[PDB]
Every structure is written in structure tokens, then in C-alpha cells.
Design a protein around this ligand. Structure first.
Ligand SMILES: [Zn+2]
Length: 465
DNA sequence: AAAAAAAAAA
């Protein structure tokens, strides 16, 4: 066995990994130096009878449900084959914006189809990585030897390829975006091996904790999209405390922001202000507090990694940062307040699709679920097992109804049909139809997009009648 | 060993 990178991409029918369903999946395997191993993979997913796609999404990808209905297979066979690629030992699974999007989709596909939601990402020396954050880090820290497009720097993949001399034909097709991803990976590793190798070696959470010192509030440069392009997605942060409820989260202070509220205000108002919209503040200062999830490949380094001139380029004032840090180190009651902001319960939906983060499944249940996968769908009803987790019973019905409709008996068929009738209410279809209509006018002068809106209208019409 | 449901990238 040898270490490889697996570049992957999804195209989905919507922006919500739990409720929306996937459409296309692509992947290429490569060695340490980015050379294709074997054949690229690209497949579709046959969307079930209880789902209509977001019009927005179909407009973006050009993939109609009929398209995926034809050349794709059920979500259970989709899941199974992505699973076998993802679980090849010593694989680093990566992509573009895959940590916040694609991996979430992956987790839910496994959850719905009885695979471990997470194992693919740690077991047999597996790991994940996000290339979007690397591009951003490169622009902030070591921009020399690459072109960065503007409008303010854009990190949309189609722009970064075009503005560097790489084929970018038919974007938002999965296979092409993987190729472009591979493209940016080679470039940066060539032009900036120092930063690239550093970033890769720091994808794992244990290396990152080596940088984080709560008691000293030792400052760090942090590149993250939430900081905004108007300052290169970069600032100097300090760790105040480990999040009281989430163990993979550290509470940072953005030293570039205004620390009046933290000194002045108390626990509750601050929480209110933090979740106050950027527009409803009036004159009030923003809370310069941000969570960093150490399992989500965040970009962190020692302060001096942002070099004097680079900080000059992005317009980050170092003196004002050092000013803030020194006041904070002398004002420990601030640790109290920021902890308190995050130390308050939550309610999930009664929809089992949206329940992955209810908690891990036990050993006993995995066994159970392992046996589910090993049973012929036609013998599932006869299977005599009991599950501890309330979720599993509910997932199993959905699995069966969505992937194996013919294995349902009469009463289960009647149950399913009631589900479908509860999804496709009159109020919902009107909302759906209203949206298509709106888009049809908004694109009256576009044959390509109206044909899609027509297609979506037809698919909706047949799937509910 | 694994998680958590403002800015800008999907
Ligand atoms: Zn894509």
C-alpha cells in the first residue's frame, strides 16, 4: 500500500446536505506528486420519489432530475461505491470547499444508507484536506509567483484557473472541477513548497494544538473566509478558552476588531450582539469573537508567519492588535464572559434525515447495521433484530422505501404514500411552482436555462401524479 | 476514533 490523494467533487440538487440529495460524484486518485492512478470515476444518483430539487441548483449545474434518473443508480448503490473508494487505506480525501460542503454530504449519504458517517476520514491512516483554505492562505502569506483575480480577490475555482492559464471548460461539472482542483494543487506545491508542505502537515488536529496555548493567549495568524476578502481573509487571533460544549472548538479573539464590548458589556447582551445581524447594530461595535474548529482543517500559524510587508498589503495594523492582546492578558474576567456566551440548549427536527448529530451509534448497533447491509433487501422485512437507537428503525424504513420500493408490502406502501402526500402539500407545490415561474421571467432571454425550468416543471408534474 | 445541526465558497 502507498499514500495517495483522492480528489473528489459533488454536484447536488440543493445546498442542504441533510435534506437535499446529491446528483453527481467525481474522483481521481493521485500519488504524492499529483499523477493520475487508474481511471477517473464519475457517476450519478437516481433521485427518490419523495424529493424535488432546488431550481437554483439545477440552474447552476444543468443537471436535470430526469438526467440523473436515467444514467444514475439508487442512493444505496451510490453510497456503497463512494464508500469503497473512500476507505482504501492510506488515502487523503480532499477537494475544494469540501470540509464545509462536500464532506457534510458524504456524512449524510453514509448515515442514510447505513455506513459509518466518519470512519472514511480517519481509519487506516485516512485523513481529509481542503484546498480552498490553502489558496486563501497562499494569497495572504506567500502570494509571489501566482495570479490572483479581483473585482477584491476572488477564490472561485473558475477564476483562479482562467487567470493562470488552465482549462476551465464547463464548470460545475464534477469531473472538470476535480481537474481544476488538481491544477491549483500542482501550481501552489511548485511555487510555494514551503507553505504547501507546512499546511498539509498541519491538517491533523494534534499538530494544530501544538500552536494553541490558552493560558498565555499566544497570538496566531489565522486565515479564514469569515474575516472577509477586504482584508485577505486574515487576522491575528488569540485563544481565550476551549469551547465549553464543543471539544473540537477553540474560542478566539480577533485582535484586529474592537474589544470595547468584551470589557464593557456582560454575558447575555454580548451573546445577543454576536448573533445580531451585521446591519442591525447601528453604531454598536461587533464582538470580535470567532470559533476555530480544529477538526475542520483551519489555517493557523505563529504570528510572524504574516510578514511585515504582507500585513501592510492587506491593511492589518499590528500595533493595534498587540495593543488589544496586552489589555486582554490583563483583564481575565473576559475569559469568563466569552465562555458564558457559548454555554447556553438546542432542539433537532423530528425528521430522521436531519438527525445525524444526535450522537454516535454504539458498537452493538454497528453490528446490527452491518447485518442490514449484508441482507438481501427482499429479506429485510423478515429480519428479526432489535435496535437500541430510536433513529435506526426510522432510517431503515426510508432506506427501503426510497431504494427498494417493490420490497414494501401493502401497509408499508400505504405509509409511504402518506409520507409522499405530506411532503407534496398544496402549499409546498405552490411555493415550488411560484419559484419556477419567477425564474422563467427572470431568464426569458435564455434558451439554455428555460429548457431546464421546463424540465423541472415536467418532472415535478409527473412525480406527484 | 468519530459530532454538532457573519463571509464567501459550494
Ligand atoms: Zn463542482
Amino acid at each position: 500500500q502507498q499514500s495517495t490523494f483522492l480528489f473528489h467533487d459533488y454536484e447536488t440538487f440543493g445546498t442542504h446536505p441533510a435534506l437535499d440529495r446529491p446528483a453527481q460524484f467525481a474522483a481521481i486518485r493521485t500519488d504524492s506528486e499529483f499523477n493520475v492512478i487508474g481511471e477517473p470515476e464519475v457517476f450519478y444518483c437516481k433521485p427518490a420519489d419523495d424529493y424535488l430539487p432546488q431550481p437554483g441548483a439545477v440552474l447552476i449545474t444543468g443537471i436535470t432530475p430526469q438526467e440523473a434518473r436515467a444514467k444514475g443508480e439508487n442512493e444505496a448503490a451510490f453510497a456503497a461505491r463512494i464508500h469503497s473508494l473512500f476507505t482504501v487505506p492510506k488515502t487523503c480525501i480532499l477537494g475544494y470547499n469540501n470540509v464545509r460542503f462536500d464532506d457534510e454530504v458524504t456524512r449524510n449519504i453514509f448515515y442514510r444508507n447505513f455506513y459509518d458517517p466518519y470512519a472514511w476520514s480517519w481509519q487506516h491512516d485516512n485523513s481529509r484536506w481542503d484546498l480552498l483554505d490553502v489558496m486563501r492562505a497562499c494569497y495572504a502569506l506567500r502570494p509571489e509567483g501566482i495570479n490572483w483575480p479581483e473585482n477584491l480577490p476572488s477564490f472561485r475555482l473558475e477564476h483562479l484557473t482562467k487567470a493562470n492559464g488552465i482549462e476551465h471548460s464547463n464548470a460545475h461539472d464534477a469531473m472538470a472541477d476535480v481537474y481544476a482542483t488538481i491544477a491549483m494543487a500542482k501550481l501552489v506545491k511548485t511555487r510555494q513548497p514551503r507553505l504547501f508542505d507546512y499546511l498539509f502537515t498541519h491538517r491533523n488536529k494534534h499538530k494544530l494544538m501544538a500552536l494553541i496555548d490558552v493560558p498565555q493567549m499566544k497570538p496566531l495568524v489565522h486565515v479564514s473566509g469569515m474575516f472577509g476578502a477586504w482584508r485577505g481573509n486574515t487576522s491575528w487571533v488569540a485563544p481565550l478558552a476551549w469551547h465549553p460544549e464543543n471539544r473540537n472548538a477553540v474560542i478566539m479573539v480577533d485582535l484586529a476588531g474592537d474589544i470595547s464590548p468584551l470589557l464593557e458589556l456582560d454575558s447575555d447582551t454580548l451573546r445577543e450582539r454576536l448573533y445580531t445581524a451585521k446591519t442591525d447594530l447601528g453604531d454598536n461595535a461587533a464582538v470580535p469573537v470567532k470559533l476555530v474548529h480544529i477538526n475542520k482543517c483551519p489555517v493557523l500559524a505563529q504570528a510572524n508567519t504574516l510578514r511585515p510587508e504582507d500585513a501592510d498589503r492587506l491593511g492589518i495594523n499590528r500595533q493595534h492588535c498587540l495593543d488589544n492582546l496586552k489589555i486582554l492578558r490583563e483583564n481575565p474576567q473576559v475569559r469568563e464572559k466569552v465562555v458564558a456566551i457559548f454555554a447556553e440548549p438546542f432542539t433537532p427536527s423530528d425528521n430522521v434525515d436531519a438527525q445525524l448529530y444526535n450522537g454516535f451509534f454504539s458498537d452493538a448497533d454497528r453490528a446490527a447495521m452491518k447485518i442490514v447491509l449484508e441482507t438481501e433487501p427482499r429479506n429485510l422485512p423478515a429480519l428479526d433484530i432489535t435496535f437500541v437507537d430510536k433513529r435506526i428503525e426510522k432510517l431503515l424504513f426510508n432506506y427501503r422505501a426510497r431504494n427498494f420500493p417493490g420490497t414494501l408490502d401493502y401497509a408499508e406502501q400505504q405509509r409511504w404514500l402518506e409520507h409522499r402526500r405530506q411532503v407534496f402539500t398544496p402549499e409546498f407545490l405552490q411555493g415550488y411552482a411560484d419559484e419556477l415561474q419567477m425564474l422563467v421571467q427572470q431568464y426569458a432571454d435564455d434558451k439554455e436555462k428555460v429548457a431546464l425550468l421546463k424540465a423541472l416543471w415536467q418532472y415535478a408534474d409527473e412525480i406527484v401524479h
